[model samples]
Target chain A: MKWMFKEDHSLEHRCVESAKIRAKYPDRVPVIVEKVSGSQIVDIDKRKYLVPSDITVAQFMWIIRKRIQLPSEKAIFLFVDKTVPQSSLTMGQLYEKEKDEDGFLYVAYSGENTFGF
Target chain B: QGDVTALFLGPPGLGKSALIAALCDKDVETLPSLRAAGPGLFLGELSCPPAAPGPWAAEANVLVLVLPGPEGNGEPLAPALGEAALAALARGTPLLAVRNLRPGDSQTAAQARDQTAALLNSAGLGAADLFVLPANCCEELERLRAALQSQAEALRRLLPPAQDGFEVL
Candidate 1:
């Protein structure tokens, strides 16, 4: 029943594991990528990630797209919590603002559904 | 070698017609607003993105977000640019902003540009795609065209919706 990495691991364990990585990789941001249930996009093979802190959110989205082998014809919109993020902010800047209690920044994605807005 | 439809979305009177006219190599005459409501419209011509959205809005190969200084509205939507901003985001459309340098907007010029980006950033849209253009410099079209042409040609990968038939069956 537990699908999220947080749901699968204890809060204590998640923080320690994140700290385990942070001490050794100061220039990288620890990330956990997930999908919204019922979204048509493909699920990434790897859920845990370590990306350069200097890379912007848009760049991070591209890497996630490549990781999933998503075609341009399919949408891969990224967000933290539920709010969309500026693609120009570096991961480090965003992390400082939205990092989770477990010490990893959570990023979610969805398909580009055509809504008449 | 073909038409790359660029829809200009901004508040009224920021040289949308002027820029398009020069780029199209013809004087774009002002047409009385053709009132229509809803999505799925053609985009070969237009001033506003039409708050209701034309199907052509989504079909637009690229959207040029025009932000003339003091066009600010202090909303997260950032000025009168709300409709197209959401449209571009809703469709996952590839977009870029033009901080059209307005006359008499000396110091506030950069503020408006930054304000545009700041609001865009807050809206969860990226400022990385934003660009700058002068209000009436018709000669500047070529390079901007060069950029827009390829920008549409750029990012060649997974994206979807509206390009194909919209069916509920």
Candidate 2:
């Protein structure tokens, strides 16, 4: 019930404990990756991926990058509820932080050319 | 191929060139106002990552686009401002919004930032992304320099380790 963010938007801690949640429900968390206005969506449309509740968002980003065959030179900016997500945050933590009335984590992603800028 | 580059975009009289010159520790009067003819208005190197000996390697290289700022004239948004933003987005370059505020005009600066934030947000940047610089003072210039260096460090982290094995040594 207590929010982790401080006055500023920086993350208080990285990673969330999934054991407590799994003890109650015993199921993997579901994630929806949606594309917002930006460049390079590749061939992926909006889709769902079931992942372990313990995996960090940063690790999940790498998984998405590989799934879409995104080159290393490209950077992916992922936002949950219009705010940047810290790489260390886990699915369970994010769910608790910004889940909607329907209880779903909607993550919006955009691609950026990484090297020069 | 070598140095990191960032483009500056604003309006004419918003102190875009002045800020760049001051941040680079140069005299603004000596430098000409960047013309609208070419892609790059100025080029400079920031002494970041603490330069090492024997080679002239810097933490990052910068390419700035000095454009007009809000003049409070008839136009709500300058044509050049939007153009530069689109160009930066197309090139996948990080674009920073630079605004010049009057000395001791914190209230006006805050208002200007609010208005500009709306425009920048419509252009895909966050509301607080704009870097509002105060009037050209020695202290303010130093502040701008520190800001640019911080940005340079963030950009450096995004670079690939090496283009080839020869440079890795």
Candidate 3:
């Protein structure tokens, strides 16, 4: 299944355009989501997904939540270079920041139900 | 969940409290100690924008640690940051190094940021684990909120079961 979608600017309605992109993706900047935390190297929980690079961090969060089937109540956080929490940083910027040793920009994610405070 | 408390170590008059209070959009106040024998300290919580939006758990518990700011332009890390590092190691809590810069003092902030990176790097903290804030004008409020949320989320994972011997650093 293709989870990636390209933006159709010709459409006037935002929700409708989003729905169409959700349904299909003929053209769009593509990036990959990699699971870096919460599981061990030997565990099967490790996963990856292809995503559009142009979307905002807010939208990216939704895509990640949907792909993992996480509860809507659960909160997710994304990070780059392990310490920098640039949630607003675009995937295109991420690609510009630093690709993996193999030339791929992978975003690491973590989630929690409680706020530890 | 208990308030996620982080010690803010910087010199006095560095606007640490003001910066935190503004970013969190909460009033700066002296909070009574939560522990029976614990000493009272400055405390506040900021509401960050949620990832998926609409009433998610996003308030991070922040405990401020006010230390003396550097004395001069080229002065080394304040003795307080050293104290802060020790406290972080002992309490196993996150550390935020606040660099107070004049409104137009990007040069100083950049210098302090690099020094802080070195300090944290030596303290077993990679760039991802280090929380450095330049309180010049609160220019990066959104970025600050995002970082706080990230650390809070990490702290939540440090809980038991999923603990898996999880270390916050």
Q: Per-prediction DockQ scores?
A: 0.01, 0.01, 0.01
- State the lDDT of candidate 3 residue by residue for B1-169, as single tens digits: 2224333334445565566555555312223011111111223321211111111111112323332234545443434344434544455555454444555443566665676567556655433233344544544555655555566556644432211221111
lDDT of 1 by residue, B2-97 (tens): 223456666556676655554445312222111111111112334553443343345455666766554344332443455556676777666766
Worst 10 residues of 1 chain B by lDDT: B33-42
- Residue B15's lDDT in candidate 1: 71
> Model 1: what is its DockQ?
0.01
Weakest ten-residue segment in model 1 chain A by summed lDDT: A15-24
Off by over 4 Å in 3: A1-117, B26-76, B104-109, B122-139, B154-169
Cα lDDT of model 2 by residue, A22-98, tens digit: 22233455455666543456745334555676888898888777777888987777778768888898877887787
Lowest lDDT 10-mer window, candidate 3 chain B? B48-57
Each model's backbone clash number: 14, 7, 13
Give lDDT per model, in order: 0.59, 0.47, 0.41
Give the lDDT of residue B9 in candidate 2: 37
Identify the leading candidate in terms of lDDT. Answer: 1
Q: How high is each candidate's TM-score?
A: 0.39, 0.36, 0.35
Instruction: List model 3 lDDT by residue over A1-117, tens digit each.
Output: 111211322211222222222223323322445544343221113233334557666777676676677777766766555654466766556655754432334465666413211
Clashes, model 2: 7
